[PDB]
Amino acid sequence: SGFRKMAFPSGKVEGCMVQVTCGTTTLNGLWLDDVVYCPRHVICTSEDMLNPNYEDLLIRKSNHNFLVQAGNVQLRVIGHSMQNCVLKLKVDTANPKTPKYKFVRIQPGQTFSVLACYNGSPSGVYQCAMRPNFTIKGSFLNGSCGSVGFNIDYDCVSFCYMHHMELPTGVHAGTDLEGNFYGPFVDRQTAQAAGTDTTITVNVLAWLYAAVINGDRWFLNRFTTTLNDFNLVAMKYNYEPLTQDHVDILGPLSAQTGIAVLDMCASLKELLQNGMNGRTILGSALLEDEFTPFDVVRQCSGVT
Amino acid sequence: SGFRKMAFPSGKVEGCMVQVTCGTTTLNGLWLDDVVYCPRHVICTSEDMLNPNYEDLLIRKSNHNFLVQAGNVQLRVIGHSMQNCVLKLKVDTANPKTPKYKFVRIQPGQTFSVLACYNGSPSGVYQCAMRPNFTIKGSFLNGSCGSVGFNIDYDCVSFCYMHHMELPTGVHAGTDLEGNFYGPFVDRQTAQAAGTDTTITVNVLAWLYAAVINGDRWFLNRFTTTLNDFNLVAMKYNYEPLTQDHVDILGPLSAQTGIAVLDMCASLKELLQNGMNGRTILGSALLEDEFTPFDVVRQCSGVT
Ligand SMILES: Cc1ccncc1NC(=O)Cc1cc(Cl)cc(O[C@@H]2CC(=O)N2)c1
Ligand SMILES: Cc1ccncc1NC(=O)Cc1cc(Cl)cc(O[C@@H]2CC(=O)N2)c1
């Protein structure tokens, strides 16, 4: 029993973190096989960030200008290329610590662990969700660019995020490992605003199932609702519309607790309309939406 | 910017997790040098847990009855001894992955990362605090016994916790790596209750400093207070009495924000007396007490 915002063990990812320096700028790179991936804004000076032409900027750069350092050893760069917003630095040595890996583009609402790094050194690990507005509410400072987001399936690490920038709102934006930004963000120091961030309804419900499994049942009521009636309430509170696919994904949790999804929706409806009344759920005074139904099942069953 | 319940990177600890089996029971062990540490209740059957005499139970056990497995390889046990509530199984092979390590007994209010494990395999990592009542609000299931709590100082891992049991209240209890339980708990399946759990005032204040550093300043008021006046309020709300040592430890955070500790105490006083009024602080609707002043400084500065 107990329910925590749990991250994946970070060891397989620590063994991939490297430091990439280009002139004055130092950020993190991800070393898998003989390639180091990092944000392409490593080649920019503070003046270049206002309106960078990365193709022109990369032309004034050669393999020897990219300093890659893994621990205390220098990696020799034999190739460089830009793929969307990431630079791929081909090095002469394959990472002996490269785990089984995949590059995946995650969906909004899905979760992942972040290994925050500075100077190619991991400082901490936390669990995040890709927000419906394609931002992440992370914890990153200057130097954290190149820090990655990932998931682990037994021995396979799926890299899903690379940190590039913080918006003036304090939320974070970045790319998949192919350099494509999540959301409308561009790697340029210009006013960029994150759209309306909605609450991931299927995740809140999964967390309400986690609460029931862990003894917190005060919010369970004698009511039920329908998908349409619940969604009228969800829209009012800027919650993602619940679909039959979401009801389906909640299925295993509904089967374990014996509480129909629409019955849980009715509890959520009353919690939205009436608030918590000073009460808590899993030690939280607000509705948590950063646990997918998969995270709940795996934490509440014990998947290693 | 951004503030998350961040855990230490777990790689150095994953390289130490092993599986210890004794008859029917399987739990986790910690392999450092040629010694595997695990909870001594691994030798108990379900009938033994009601009133175990570990000295007598250990006498019916020989080195060959303790199955230690690191990954897919079996470790040969050449010695066994009980040190308080932990068994130390001397193996013939030193862990080639043993990091620089220390065994420390942490103080209540201090934080640490937990690497939850099952069958010697890490499943997740989260940040915890040793509660003033010496319990931890963790996330552990059956098989998680032997999972450890730790801190990292650059390259040195300080092991501070080994998970042993869950209380009927859903909170967790365990020992330091010398087998001494934190709190009055005994490793016996008998009704054990955790005393009153108070809020770690110095940690809430440190988190209020983290909030100010990250833009959340709504709670800052035009008032001040004294240590004695604040502590009258803290006692009412089951908060730890704030001492001059706590004021001292808050010093670097007070210097960064330019907000005197007693001014922050006055904001906390009003938040305790009036609540949040539907507002949030660092995305939380309640006062968070699981970040020490050290955690705040290190997260808000970027210590790797
Ligand atoms: C300092 C820090 C803290 C946490 N995480 C990241 C950083 N770094 C940056 O954000 C630097 C940067 C890189 C790019 Cl590619 C674009 C930038 O401008 C965006 C546009 C907008 O809004 N801000 C800024
Ligand atoms: C099942 C599980 C889930 C999470 N973490 C741990 C466990 N395991 C246990 O708790 C087994 C156990 C070991 C001991 Cl040494 C004493 C025990 O009785 C205490 C006394 C009281 O209260 N409960 C029970």
Q: Are A9 and B118 within 8 A, CB to CB? A: no
Q: Are A295 and B301 in contact (CB under 8 A)?
A: no
The residue ranges of DSSP E strands in chain A, in sequence order, are 17-22, 25-32, 35-39, 66-70, 73-75, 77-83, 86-91, 100-103, 111-118, 121-129, 148-153, 156-166, 172-175
Cα(A21)–Cα(A23) distance, integer angstroms: 6
Q: Which ligand is nearest to the CA of B145?
A: 2
DSSP 3-state of A8? coil
Q: List all residues 6 or more positions away from A222 whose beta carbon is below 8 Å from its beta carbon.
A: none
Q: Which CATH number is associated with domain A198-301?
A: 1.10.1840.10
If we measure between CA atoms, which residue out of A212, A161, A158, A166 comes closest to residue A185? A166
In this structure, CATH architecture of domain A1-14+100-197: Beta Barrel (2.40)
Ligand 2 centroid – CA B189 distance (Å): 7
Q: Are A173 and A183 in contact (CB under 8 A)?
A: yes
Tokens 């066994």 locate to B80
B5: nearest CB among A5, A214, A276: A5
Mutate to test the interface with A, among B3, B27, B123, B290 (most CBs of A within 10 A): B123
State whether residue B256 sits within 8 Å of chain A by CB. no
Cα(A67)–Cα(A65) distance, integer angstroms: 6
Tell me how far CA of residue B249 lies from CA of A96, B232, B246, in angstroms. Answer: 43, 21, 5
Experimental resolution (Å): 2.0
Residue of chain B minimizing CA distance to A141 = B1
Q: Are A222 and A266 in contact (CB under 8 A)?
A: no
3-state helix, strand, coil in chain B (%, to 5): 25, 30, 45
Tell me how far CA of residue B215 lies from CA of A121, B277, B299, in angstroms. Answer: 27, 19, 15
Ligand 1 centroid – CA A165 distance (Å): 3
Q: At what angle do helices B244-257 and B201-213 cross, to 10 degrees?
A: 0
Q: Are B105 and B180 in contact (CB under 8 A)?
A: yes
Question: What residues line ligand 2, using a CB cutoff of 6 Å?
Answer: B 41, 140-142, 144-145, 164-168, 172, 187-190, 192
Q: Are A28 and A146 in contact (CB under 8 A)?
A: yes
Question: What residues line ligand 1, using a CB cutoff of 6 Å?
Answer: A 41, 140-142, 144-145, 164-168, 172, 187-190, 192
Q: Which CATH number is associated with domain A15-99?
A: 2.40.10.10
Distance between terminal CA atoms of chain A?
16
CB-neighbour burial class of residue A97 (10 A; exposed 0-12, middle 13-18, buried 19+): middle
What does the domain layout of chain B look like in residue ranges? 1-14+100-197, 15-99, 198-301
Q: How was this structure determined?
A: X-ray
CB-neighbour burial class of residue A175 (10 A; exposed 0-12, middle 13-18, buried 19+): buried
Domains B1-14+100-197 and B15-99 alike in fold: yes
* Closest CA to ligand 1's atom 8: A165
User: Which residues of chain A does B215 touch, with a Cβ-Cβ cutoff of 8 Å?
Assistant: 170
Cα(A115)–Cα(A42) distance, integer angstroms: 19
Q: Which helix (H) or strand (E) is B73 found in, with range? A: strand B73-75
